[PDB]
Amino acid sequence: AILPDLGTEILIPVCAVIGIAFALFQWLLVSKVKLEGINDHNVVVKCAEIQNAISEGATSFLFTEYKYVGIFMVAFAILIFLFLGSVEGFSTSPQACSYDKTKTCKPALATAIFSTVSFLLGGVTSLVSGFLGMKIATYANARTTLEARKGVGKAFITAFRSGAVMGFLLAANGLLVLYIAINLFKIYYGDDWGGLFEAITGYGLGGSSMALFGRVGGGIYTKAADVGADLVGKDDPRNPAVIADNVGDNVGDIAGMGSDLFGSYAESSCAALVVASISSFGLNHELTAMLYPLIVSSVGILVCLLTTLFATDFFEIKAVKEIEPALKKQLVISTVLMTIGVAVVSFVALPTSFTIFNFGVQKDVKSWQLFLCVAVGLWAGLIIGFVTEYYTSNAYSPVQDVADSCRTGAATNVIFGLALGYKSVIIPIFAIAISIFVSFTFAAMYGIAVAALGMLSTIATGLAIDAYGPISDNAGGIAEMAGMSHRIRERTDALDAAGNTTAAIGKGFAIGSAALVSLALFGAFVSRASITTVDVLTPKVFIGLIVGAMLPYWFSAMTMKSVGSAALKMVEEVRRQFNTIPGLMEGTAKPDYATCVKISTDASIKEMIPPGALVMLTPLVVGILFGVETLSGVLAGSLVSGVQIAISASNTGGAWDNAKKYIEAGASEHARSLGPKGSDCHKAAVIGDTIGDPLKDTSGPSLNILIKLMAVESLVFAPFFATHGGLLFKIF
């Protein structure tokens, strides 16, 4: 191809620098809004004091998280090393390659180390970019609320700039760190590109492993705090739970999504390299083709930068009616730009033809067909988000049909909205099915991997809009609580409901991008374990498959009780707060926020530990006791039945949110029809909302790690399961 081995390695890390640079420019412009148009004073001081308490509890949350993360990340690094060393008997003797039997590779010990290096790198990059994101989110929240004094547009812009910092840091870092890791490892591995990219494969697992904390644990917290909206018998800052939630608004949708998307990005990029490593590109050693996934991802930053400027600088917002589109336009602009962008990348850095591995054979693949495989992914993303919009927006028919149920009952609001989520799934599945059936065809599993990266090429703006959402729930709450001009409070609540419609898409975007990555890994694991058939007939698989299909249902049952309990742990903790501290319950003194967070945040991560086991140990148990053939069936069942629950769950929970937020909004005859702000309908809608609060933000999103992480886990430990397979079959 046209772009040379230099060209890739001088391009990649420019575009990641440009990314990080962009981000720090945007941060600098949000710093320009110091905490003339001040009107009046003392509400500014009141904002400040709420914004502080946000960080008190935010920076609390993180340190209580890390208290387990270091413990976990070492414990596992050991564990990953032992299990990867033991295939070779920790031999220092160069093994003949597990692909081209003839030529000689490095020892699977020296990958046991190099896997355990990248595992730290990844788990640190997920960590850091989420820290930086938590840090900007807590910065911008009041500096938006404030800029709402000046007007809707001027606020939005200095809120979506903030959200952009998160996307571009997260994406750029994940690209940069990976890019470095490849070049530092390529030093030791030399020409053994197969062996090299089996060790990069840990980076995928590292970010995903972390994602388990950020999205399952932090999820269990965020909605513990939200569902910690409990009397008998006192929404005031004087309730620390209230401000524990506004912290959560940031956690479950910045760290939460960010970790999952970083996960979904990284572990897709590894499954794309491990097929191409044992394909044409990696066999011949054609850097700018191995690293095509990165060339794709690196243009993606460049593209998304440009498309971000349409909503930041060229066009600018006037009316609130224009706001929810401006977000959605971004999505189309990028999708559209990226198709042109990745049309060039395909042209300029792939050879016209090559072979792509699958199950022994080298498949022939013309390089336009790889363009179709990212494109199909690119555009299924755009589709699957919009199908979602429809099912989870008060704009469209079906959310309003739910709102009309809460007239008749609270039992009806919930019934109609269970049914809504259930019916949501159809288009996202068929959409996936098509993106598979295109992709499996053109390239093989490398196509499916490419296609998952396809969904995630746009991942800066994709994140930015997801990141914009919780900034505006804080901006909202910082106005409510600081008690501001009803003019301002309307301008925030505008950004709020727009972000609400937007962050349902966000969950959608992810639950498909998962299934695509959790499939990419799955076959890239089969391609490690050297399986070539998986008979649903042969009972070794089927029993594993039916049990695999059950695991999300079980896993869910944990994440459900987890949040339900820990919210009751929050209630008991506020009861304490009032009944120990003096001047709260009176009103002289405030509560201790930091402690509300900590005491609740542990009780979450504790509650996370069993779900986390079921994710992490299912492969180790199944893979040891029964073969890789049986773990194969498990990983398939977890996939098929799991993605269903994930969609239906977080769509029902978005639907009910916006049904309640619709009644509240009163922006139609019908909304007003149901919607006195505390009406009989509003009760049955808001009963519905809190049931959704978990489904939306804890149970459904957690699900897309159970699929993802089980796969990278197995991919990594495929050697170990191959070398010590059915121990329960060895004895019998």
Place this chain on the structure above:
Amino acid sequence: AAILPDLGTEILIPVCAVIGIAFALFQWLLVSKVKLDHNVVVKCAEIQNAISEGATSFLFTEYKYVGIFMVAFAILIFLFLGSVEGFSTSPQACSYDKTKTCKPALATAIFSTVSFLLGGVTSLVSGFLGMKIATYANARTTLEARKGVGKAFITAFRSGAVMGFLLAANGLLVLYIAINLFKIYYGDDWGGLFEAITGYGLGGSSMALFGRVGGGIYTKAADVGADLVGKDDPRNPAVIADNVGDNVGDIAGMGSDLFGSYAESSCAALVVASISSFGLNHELTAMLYPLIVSSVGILVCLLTTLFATDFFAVKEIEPALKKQLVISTVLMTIGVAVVSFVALPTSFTIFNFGVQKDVKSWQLFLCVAVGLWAGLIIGFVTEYYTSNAYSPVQDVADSCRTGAATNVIFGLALGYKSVIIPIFAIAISIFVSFTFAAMYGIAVAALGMLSTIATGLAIDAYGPISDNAGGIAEMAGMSHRIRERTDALDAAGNTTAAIGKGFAIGSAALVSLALFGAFVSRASITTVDVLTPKVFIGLIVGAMLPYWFSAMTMKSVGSAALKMVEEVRRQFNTIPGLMEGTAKPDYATCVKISTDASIKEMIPPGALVMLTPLVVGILFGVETLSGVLAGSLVSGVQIAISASNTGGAWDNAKKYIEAGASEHARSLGPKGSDCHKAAVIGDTIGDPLKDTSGPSLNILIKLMAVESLVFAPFFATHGGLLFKIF
């Protein structure tokens, strides 16, 4: 070569069937000796008359469609199985043995159709007669509460045992009769004999699509027609229309479903074994081993039934039902040991995907046994998760002291965790079955679960009767002593019929798979690769179908309950005398509008189940349909268990508070408390999941297979019409 000879089998079978029949007649007869101060006895009669006007309005408004469909689909089955051989009359070499000659393929097509019609006609009959004992014996329970608990409960449980035996014998007898009228043609073509007999299974499962989806939507469209504005009061026609509903759903629906589950597992045994030792050689009493296992079931359950009629407080009642189960499980292990001894050779071969595989008859006996003891374990694992008695429902009651949001969250939690142990129970059954026999094992082990279907159905059919007994008391304004007696049965009925809901879904996954394997055995596929996208897109979209099919049964029953509140305004506002006091509401009409509404709401989910084989099987291959049939199984079984158990809890949590019979139940439980209101918002969310969206779900799994088994030659012959074009 089998001890009990081919005469001895054929003479034994329909004795048992008729012996069950004769026991059911005897049991209906004894429930007639209960003849129906004053003005309360006529109150009860006034209700019992009105129950029958509603139920018999429903059934007749359903059969408006059942005939219309059965004939239309009969057209369709013949035309499709015909076109396989070009509607040819000239006999064709046997697919099971290339040497010998089989009958012409439209001989199967005609004969499939005959058996399809029989099976529908038996499902229809067994449900019709089942109603006509529930409707009859509901008040005769309430009245007999005037003679205590154990004298009411007996004359209730009998009424359900009648239907359980009537159903059991009828299905066995009609299959048996069909086999001999069919052998009459096929002769030595035992493969092509039992190829037609499987229509019976498709017949029985289609009438479950009417019974427990249409009748499903109705049963809990009425129950959730419990709605203000404005106002148990019989001047509201929905109040009674539900007492018909409590009957229809768990009599006609559980009848039809477990008749279906039975038929299609027995058919799936027959097909497999027709191309194995037994049916290659032509050894009847070894082929018909399924039917011998069944027929002893009747006899074992007849004995056990008498433990809860002749041979033995309100605290005593729930055990009465849980013994009825354990008894006939312990009996039937001996019962089937006998059947396996006296009707099986030392050793044999079973067809799995080409190879005639070594199987020794004791290994076959372990297959019914491992199936038998799954079906015992699985429903006890239910009980634990759906009973006010045990811990996890008592947790859900403590939820409603906090939120009504919390009641539902911790219920959605409940059912989700519910699944784990039943899934291992089903999986452990699978691994042991496939080992010992192969596909025959699974199919036998599914019959192992349904070997106790006589008494199994009795406890499922006692349930709703004793809801009507609790409500016939309430509406007839009876003695408070009497109300605390009938409502005692009601509550143990709520436990028991929740167990039977897990029993059925247990059975289902097993039989769905017995069929799946048999569909692969007919289609001649040696593999089903999860790698090949032909199957993967199948598999993922199979997992999607139940979520779709739920969304429909859900919003069906949702708006259908709101159509029932619409119709109750019309009766109050058009009839002279109602709203005042003069004239009671027309019950026949309040069922009519609601029933059509339900069966019209049914028709699109009833379509999703029915076309999907056809569209997949035609457009794409039997490869793809193999994919789709494995996804819908593994996924839909989870959603099936999650629903009915999530619902079964919230009901029993409400019914715990209402009961108030322990200090903790008093703790939450003023009979309209802050808690009780949250607990009941639970129940009315659980009503569709209880008796509509979860129990229909198992017919999506079941019927998609039998339909696919029957049309598998047509799908091979004119298969991937899209793969073929490119």
